[PDB]
Amino acid sequence: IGIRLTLPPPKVVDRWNEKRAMFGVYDNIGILGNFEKHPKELIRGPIWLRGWKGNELQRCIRKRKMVGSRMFADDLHNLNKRIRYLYKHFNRHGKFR
Amino acid sequence: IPDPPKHEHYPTPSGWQPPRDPPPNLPYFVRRSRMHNIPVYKDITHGNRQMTVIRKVEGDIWALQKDVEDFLSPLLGKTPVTQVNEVTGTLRIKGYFDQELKAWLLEKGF
Amino acid sequence: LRNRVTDRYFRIQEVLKHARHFRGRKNRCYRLAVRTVIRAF
């Protein structure tokens, strides 16, 4: 019980597909391009997560302040509740003071 | 950074002097920083540990270590405590000796 | 990334094998067997 009685199907990985064979290209565009472009501008992803990093609390304010007006009603309510809980936990709880 | 202008007399009023040309014939060599200064700095840790560091060293760093403690033993009274880092080409001495080492490294042609 | 233990069967077998010659349910139930194997050791 709790373990499979047969071997899982073997997995095949293409180490030389288009994405793997050219990962990291243009990451030094700023150094080698007279600083006309920043490697941060190559970041592809969420609007509030482009060239920025922070803890869970900080990510919630940044999402709310930038795209909060466009979120769904249920999602906005949950995001507001998450900020309230995170604010209480970080500013009032912990081993260290 | 602009290259320093040539003065008819040396050392300059601020105390700067260009490295001697040709460079000294030694197994080790120390190159000036990008501001044309001897790479000697003071380091402090824990608020009471004082160290002197020498950067931008390539060649036989052990020869430099041998020369450093020979030069510092009469001043300090015993063999100084030193750390040798080969991968980064730096030499660390316990205590503050920046002004003597800069003077010592200056007259050696570095 | 969700991680789950996959070798728990071997983790309990290394204890149950030392209790194979015992008497009662404490030779096959891990919760009982671990308490008596420690005493035996």
């Binding site: 080698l32 490697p39 592809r44 997560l49 060239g51 990093k53 990510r59 | 950074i1 | -």
Partner: protein, 252 residues
């Protein structure tokens, strides 16, 4: 014929000597030894800093990563707003909701809270220094070759593979040229159908690609481009404003 000779245009420190590299050509199978090129000692002959390589490669892989994994908490699982049974008198364990982490189908106590970013930037001089170390490692391991230009007699991809096999270059070769708009037609059609052989411009050169590919080849304009770009780092002021703004001597 007449050999091709390349000198170091940037001034060299007095205590250092240039490192020589052979110059080949791709127009023939046996067309090596076209000439000699002098490389800057401070770029192709610097210290073998493996730790610098490891941290630069780790920076490249993990700075553009964004994780989209996210799990609902007990406040986001549907329902569970009512106390199941009274606290005392029922004879069973006390609970306040059916969506608690202990309950089956409940929330997750400490789970992923995506999307999350791992973006961080190494110091500018360190990233440039990583390229110098990798080039020096390539030269020392004799897997780096210097060419004059990337024109091929035929655009046949099998011809390129046979040429690489004859010269014992390696399983995978990373090709680097000056500018994307200056690609010869033969090299583009030859490498487009090849997997282990990749063609990228000079601006696209990176440590991760160099480590992934056993063999690296550069053109003479590429070498001068790399020498100029890298040697600008170690003799420069601290930036008053971003370099994209006009300067007295930037761009050179």
């Amino acid at each position: 014929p007449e050999p091709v000779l390349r000198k170091v245009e940037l001034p060299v420190p007095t205590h250092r000597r240039p490192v020589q590299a052979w110059v080949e050509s791709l127009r023939g199978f046996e067309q090596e030894r076209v000439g000699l090129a002098d490389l800057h000692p401070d770029v192709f002959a610097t210290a073998p800093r493996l730790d610098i390589l490891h941290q630069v490669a780790m920076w490249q892989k993990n700075f553009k990563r964004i994780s989209y994994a996210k799990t609902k908490t007990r406040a986001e699982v549907r329902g569970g707003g009512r106390k199941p049974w009274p606290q005392k008198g029922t004879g069973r364990a006390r609970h306040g909701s059916i969506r608690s982490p202990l309950w089956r189908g409940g929330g997750v106590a400490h789970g992923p809270r995506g999307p999350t970013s791992y973006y961080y930037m190494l110091p500018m001089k360190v990233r440039a220094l990583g390229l110098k170390v990798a080039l020096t490692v390539k030269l020392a391991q004799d897997d780096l070759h210097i060419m004059d230009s990337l024109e091929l007699p035929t655009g046949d991809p099998q011809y390129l593979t046979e040429l690489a096999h004859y010269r014992r270059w390696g399983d995978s070769v990373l090709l680097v040229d000056l500018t994307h708009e200056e690609m010869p037609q033969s090299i583009v059609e030859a490498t487009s159908r090849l997997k282990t052989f990749n063609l990228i411009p000079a601006v696209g050169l990176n440590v991760h690609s160099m480590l992934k590919h056993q063999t690296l080849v550069l053109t003479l304009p590429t070498v001068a481009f790399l020498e100029d770009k890298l040697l600008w780092q170690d003799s420069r002021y601290r930036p008053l404003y971003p370099f994209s703004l006009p300067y007295s001597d930037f761009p050179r």
